[PDB]
Each structure stands twice: as C-alpha cells, then as structure tokens.
C-alpha cells in the first residue's frame, strides 16, 4: 500500500508539473 501511495504522489506531481508548464505557455500566448 505504501509503494502504491508513493507511486500515486509521483504520478500526480508529474501531471501537476505538466499542467504548470501548460499554464505558463498559455500565459505567454495571452501576453503576445
């Protein structure tokens, strides 16, 4: 159960970083 929870934290972190990269990208589109 621990390992699964640890793997879920790492998957969610990864998705959050991708979503933050997508927000920064669209903020640049707005600024253009």
Residues 1-32 that bind a second copy (CB under 8 A): 1-2, 5-6, 8-9, 12-13, 15-16, 19-20, 22-23, 26-27, 29-30
What H or E segment, with its residue span, contains residue 7? helix 2-31
- Name, in order, each residue with C-beta under 8 angstroms of 5's C-beta and a sequence gap of 6 or more: none
Rounded to a whole number of angstroms, the minimum distance from the CB of residue 12 to a second copy is 4
Question: What does the binding site for a second copy look like in residue numbers (CB under 8 A)?
Answer: 1-2, 5-6, 8-9, 12-13, 15-16, 19-20, 22-23, 26-27, 29-30
């Amino acid at each position: 159960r621990l390992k699964q929870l640890e793997x879920k934290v790492e998957x969610l972190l990864s998705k959050n970083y991708h979503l933050e990269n997508e927000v920064a990208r669209l903020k640049k589109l707005v600024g253009e």
